[PDB]
Amino acid sequence: PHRYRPGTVALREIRRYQKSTELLIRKLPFQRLVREIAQDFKTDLRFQSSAVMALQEACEAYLVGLFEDTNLCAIHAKRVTIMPKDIQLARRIRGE
Amino acid sequence: RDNIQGITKPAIRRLARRGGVKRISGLIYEETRGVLKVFLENVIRDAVTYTEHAKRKTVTAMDVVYALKRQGRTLYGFGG
Amino acid sequence: RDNIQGITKPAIRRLARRGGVKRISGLIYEETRGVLKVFLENVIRDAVTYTEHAKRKTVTAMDVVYALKRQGRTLYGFGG
Amino acid sequence: DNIQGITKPAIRRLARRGGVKRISGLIYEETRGVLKVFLENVIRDAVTYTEHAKRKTVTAMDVVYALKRQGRTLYGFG
Amino acid sequence: VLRDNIQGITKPAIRRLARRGGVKRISGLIYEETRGVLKVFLENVIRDAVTYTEHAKRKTVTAMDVVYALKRQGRTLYGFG
Amino acid sequence: SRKESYSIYVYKVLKQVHPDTGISSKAMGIMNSFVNDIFERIAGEASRLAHYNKRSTITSREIQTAVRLLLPGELAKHAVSEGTKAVTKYTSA
Amino acid sequence: SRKESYSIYVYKVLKQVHPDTGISSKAMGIMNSFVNDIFERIAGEASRLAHYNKRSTITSREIQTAVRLLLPGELAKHAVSEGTKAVTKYTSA
Amino acid sequence: RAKAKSRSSRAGLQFPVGRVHRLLRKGHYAERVGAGAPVYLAAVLEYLTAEILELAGNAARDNKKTRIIPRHLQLAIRNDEELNKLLGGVTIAQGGVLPNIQAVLLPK
Amino acid sequence: RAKAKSRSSRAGLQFPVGRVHRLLRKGHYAERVGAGAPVYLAAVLEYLTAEILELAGNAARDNKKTRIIPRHLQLAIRNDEELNKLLGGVTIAQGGVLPNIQAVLLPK
Which chain G residues are closer than 8 Å to B80 by Cβ?
33, 36
Given a contact cutoff of 8 angstroms between Cβ atoms, the answer to whether B8 and A24 are in contact is: no
Alpha carbon separation from C51 to C60, F49, F59 (Å, rounded): 8, 12, 17
Question: Which residues have C-beta within 8 Å of that of residue C76, sequence separation ≥ 6?
Answer: none
CA E76: distance to chain centroid? Answer: 15
Q: How far apart are CA F62 and CA H8, in angstroms?
A: 33
In degrees, rounded to 5, the angle at the alpha carbon of residue F43 between the alpha carbons of residues F38 and F49 is 130
Given a contact cutoff of 8 angstroms between Cβ atoms, the answer to whether I56 and I69 are in contact is: no
3-state secondary structure of I91: strand
End-to-end CA distance of chain C: 34
CA G21: distance to chain centroid? Answer: 24
Residue whose C-alpha is closest to residue H27's, from G47, B68, G61, G1: G47
Q: How far apart are CA F57 and CA H59, in angstroms?
A: 43
Q: How far apart are CA E41 and CA F16, in angstroms?
A: 34
Question: Which residues have C-beta within 8 Å of that of residue F53, sequence separation ≥ 6?
Answer: C53, C54
In degrees, rounded to 5, the angle at the alpha carbon of residue F87 between the alpha carbons of residues F82 and F91 is 150
Distance from CA of C39 to the nearest CA of F (A): 16
Chain F residues with CB-CB distance to G under 8 A? Answer: 16, 19-20, 77-78, 81, 85
Q: How far apart are CA B18 and CA A71, in angstroms?
A: 12
Given a contact cutoff of 8 angstroms between Cβ atoms, the answer to whether F21 and I67 are in contact is: yes
DSSP label of H79 = T
Question: Which residues have C-beta within 8 Å of that of residue G43, sequence separation ≥ 6?
Answer: H24, H27, H29
Given a contact cutoff of 8 angstroms between Cβ atoms, the answer to whether B71 and A61 are in contact is: no
3-state secondary structure of G57: strand
A30, A33, A39, A40: CA torsion to nearest 10:
-130
Are the Cβ atoms of G69 and E68 closer than 8 angstroms?
Answer: no
**Domain boundaries defined on chain G:** 1-93
Phi and psi (nearest 5°) for E77? Answer: -110, 125
Residue whose C-alpha is closest to residue A6's, from I19, C72, H105: H105
SS3 for chain A is: CCCCCCCHHHHHHHHHHHHCCCCCCCHHHHHHHHHHHHCCCCCCCEECHHHHHHHHHHHHHHHHHHHHHHHHHHHHCCCCEECHHHHHHHHHHHCC
Residue whose C-alpha is closest to residue I93's, from F26, D15, D18: F26
Which chain G residues are closer than 8 Å to F20 by Cβ?
77
* C-beta neighbour count of C62 within 10 angstroms: 16
DSSP code per residue over chain B: -GGGGGS-HHHHHHHHHHTT--EE-TTHHHHHHHHHHHHHHHHHHHHHHHHHHTT-SEEPHHHHHHHHHHHT-EEESS--
The H-assigned helical ranges of C1-80 are 9-18, 28-53, 61-71
Are the Cβ atoms of I101 and D19 closer than 8 angstroms?
Answer: yes
Of A20, A57, A75, the CB nearest to H104: A75
Given a contact cutoff of 8 angstroms between Cβ atoms, the answer to whether G67 and E51 are in contact is: no
Q: How far apart are CA H51 and CA C34, in angstroms?
A: 40
Given a contact cutoff of 8 angstroms between Cβ atoms, the answer to whether I24 and F40 are in contact is: no
Paired residues of D75 in beta bridges = I92
Long-range contact list for B45-53, CB < 8 A, 24+ apart?
B45/A41, B46/B70, B46/B71, B47/A51, B48/A38, B48/A41, B48/A42, B48/A45, B51/A45, B52/A42
* C-beta neighbour count of C60 within 10 angstroms: 13
* C-beta neighbour count of G90 within 10 angstroms: 21
Q: Is D9 exposed, middle or buried (0-12, 13-18, 19+ CB in 10 A)?
A: exposed
Paired residues of B23 in beta bridges = A81
Chains B and D touch (3+ CB pairs under 8 A): no
Phi and psi (nearest 5°) for H76? Answer: -70, -50
DSSP label of H94 = T
Given a contact cutoff of 8 angstroms between Cβ atoms, the answer to whether E40 and G34 are in contact is: no
Q: How far apart are CA F79 and CA I84, in angstroms?
A: 17
Q: How far apart are CA B2 and CA F13, in angstroms?
A: 68
For chain I, give percent helix, strand, coil, nearest 5: 50, 5, 45
Are the Cβ atoms of F20 and G77 closer than 8 angstroms?
Answer: yes
Paired residues of F58 in beta bridges = I33
Q: What is the CA radius of gyration of chain H?
A: 20
* C-beta neighbour count of E48 within 10 angstroms: 19
Which chain E residues are closer than 8 Å to G76 by Cβ?
none
Q: How far apart are CA F58 and CA F49, in angstroms?
A: 9
Question: Which residues have C-beta within 8 Å of that of residue B14, sequence separation ≥ 6?
Answer: A17, A24
Residue whose C-alpha is closest to residue G42's, from G22, G17, G60: G60
Paired residues of I67 in beta bridges = F22
Q: How far apart are CA H25 and CA H20, in angstroms?
A: 9
Given a contact cutoff of 8 angstroms between Cβ atoms, the answer to whether F64 and F80 are in contact is: yes
Which chain D residues are closer than 8 Å to I101 by Cβ?
19
CA H39: distance to chain centroid? Answer: 17
Question: Which residues have C-beta within 8 Å of that of residue A63, sequence separation ≥ 6?
Answer: B15, B32, B35, B36
HSE-up (13 A, CA, CB side) for residue B50: 16
3-state secondary structure of G72: coil
Given a contact cutoff of 8 angstroms between Cβ atoms, the answer to whether B24 and H103 are in contact is: no
Given a contact cutoff of 8 angstroms between Cβ atoms, the answer to whether I52 and D33 are in contact is: no
Q: Considering only alpha carbons, which residue of chain F is nearest residue D73?
A: F37
Distance from CA of F40 to the nearest CA of G (A): 28
Tell me the technique behind this structure.
cryo-EM
Paired residues of F23 in beta bridges = I68
Question: Which residues have C-beta within 8 Å of that of residue H9, sequence separation ≥ 6?
Answer: none
Given a contact cutoff of 8 angstroms between Cβ atoms, the answer to whether I60 and F20 are in contact is: no
Max alpha carbon distance in chain A (Å)?
Answer: 58
Which of A39-65 are b and which e, b meaning 16 or more Cβ less than 10 Å from the residue's Cβ? eeeeeebebeeebbbbbbbbbbbbbbe
Identity of the residue numbered A27: K
DSSP label of D57 = S
Q: How far apart are CA F64 and CA I19, in angstroms?
A: 20
Given a contact cutoff of 8 angstroms between Cβ atoms, the answer to whether F22 and D63 are in contact is: no
Chain F residues with CB-CB distance to C under 8 A? Answer: 49, 52-53, 61, 65, 68-69
Residue whose C-alpha is closest to residue I24's, from B1, F57, C20: F57
DSSP label of D35 = H
Are the Cβ atoms of H91 and B74 closer than 8 angstroms?
Answer: yes
Residue whose C-alpha is closest to residue I84's, from I73, I69, I71: I73
Q: What is the CA radius of gyration of chain G?
A: 16
End-to-end CA distance of chain G: 37
Residue whose C-alpha is closest to residue F33's, from F13, F15, F10: F10
In degrees, rounded to 5, the angle at the alpha carbon of residue H4 between the alpha carbons of residues H2 and H6 is 145
Alpha carbon separation from E15 to A57, C59, E9, E31, E36 (Å, rounded): 46, 88, 11, 9, 16
Identity of the residue numbered A40: D
Alpha carbon separation from H31 to G47, G52, G62, G80, H36 (Å, rounded): 10, 15, 14, 25, 15
DSSP code per residue over F23-78: E-HHHHHHHHHHHHHHHHHHHHHHHHHHHHTT-SEE-HHHHHHHHHHHS-HHHHHH
For helices F60-70 and C28-53, the axis angle rounded to 10 degrees is 170
Residue whose C-alpha is closest to residue A82's, from E48, G74, B20: B20
- Write down all domains in chain D, each with its CATH number in brackets: 1-78 (1.10.20.10)
Sign of the CA dihedral with G63 first, then G68, G72, and G78 last? positive
3-state secondary structure of I81: coil
Alpha carbon separation from B39 to A62, A67, B68, H94 (Å, rounded): 9, 15, 11, 21
* C-beta neighbour count of I48 within 10 angstroms: 17
Alpha carbon separation from A23 to A20, B18, G70, I34 (Å, rounded): 9, 11, 34, 59
Alpha carbon separation from C80 to B5, C74, F47, G11 (Å, rounded): 85, 10, 17, 48
Given a contact cutoff of 8 angstroms between Cβ atoms, the answer to whether I58 and F14 are in contact is: no
3-state secondary structure of C70: helix
Question: Which residues have C-beta within 8 Å of that of residue E32, sequence separation ≥ 6?
Answer: none
CA D63: distance to chain centroid? Answer: 11
Q: How far apart are CA H9 and CA H11, in angstroms?
A: 5
Range F1-93 has CATH code 1.10.20.10: yes
Are the Cβ atoms of A14 and H101 closer than 8 angstroms?
Answer: yes
* C-beta neighbour count of I32 within 10 angstroms: 11
Residue whose C-alpha is closest to residue D49's, from D71, D33, D75, D69: D69
Chains I and C touch (3+ CB pairs under 8 A): no
Chain C interface, mutation test: which of F41, F52, F53, most C Cβ atoms within 10 Å?
Answer: F52
Question: Which residues have C-beta within 8 Å of that of residue F9, sequence separation ≥ 6?
Answer: I14, I15, I16, I49
Q: What is the CA radius of gyration of chain F?
A: 16
Paired residues of C77 in beta bridges = none
Q: How far apart are CA F83 and CA I20, in angstroms?
A: 15
Residue whose C-alpha is closest to residue H79's, from H103, H101, H102, H95: H95
Given a contact cutoff of 8 angstroms between Cβ atoms, the answer to whether A76 and A93 are in contact is: no
List chains adjacent to chain I, taking adjacency as at least 3 C-beta pairs closer than 8 Å. D, F
SS3 for chain E is: CCCCCHHHCCHHHHHHHHHHCCCCCCCCCHHHHHHHHHHHHHHHHHHHHHHHHHHCCCCCCCHHHHHHHHHHCCCCCCCCC
Q: What is the CA radius of gyration of chain B?
A: 16
Paired residues of I33 in beta bridges = F58
Question: Which residues have C-beta within 8 Å of that of residue I4, sequence separation ≥ 6?
Answer: none
Residue whose C-alpha is closest to residue A43's, from B1, B67, B39, B52: B52
Long-range contact list for F19-22, CB < 8 A, 24+ apart?
F19/G77, F19/G78, F19/G81, F20/G77, F20/I66, F21/I57, F21/I60, F21/I66, F21/I67, F21/I68, F22/I66, F22/I67, F22/I68
**What residues 7-66 of chain C have any CB closer than 8 A to a CB of chain F?**
46, 49, 53-54, 66
Given a contact cutoff of 8 angstroms between Cβ atoms, the answer to whether A19 and H100 are in contact is: no
Given a contact cutoff of 8 angstroms between Cβ atoms, the answer to whether C5 and C34 are in contact is: no
Q: How far apart are CA H20 and CA I50, in angstroms?
A: 31
Identity of the residue numbered C12: I
Given a contact cutoff of 8 angstroms between Cβ atoms, the answer to whether I24 and I31 are in contact is: no
Sign of the CA dihedral with F56 first, then F60, F64, and F66 last? positive
CA E71: distance to chain centroid? Answer: 15
CA I77: distance to chain centroid? Answer: 10
Q: How far apart are CA D63 and CA F32, in angstroms?
A: 18
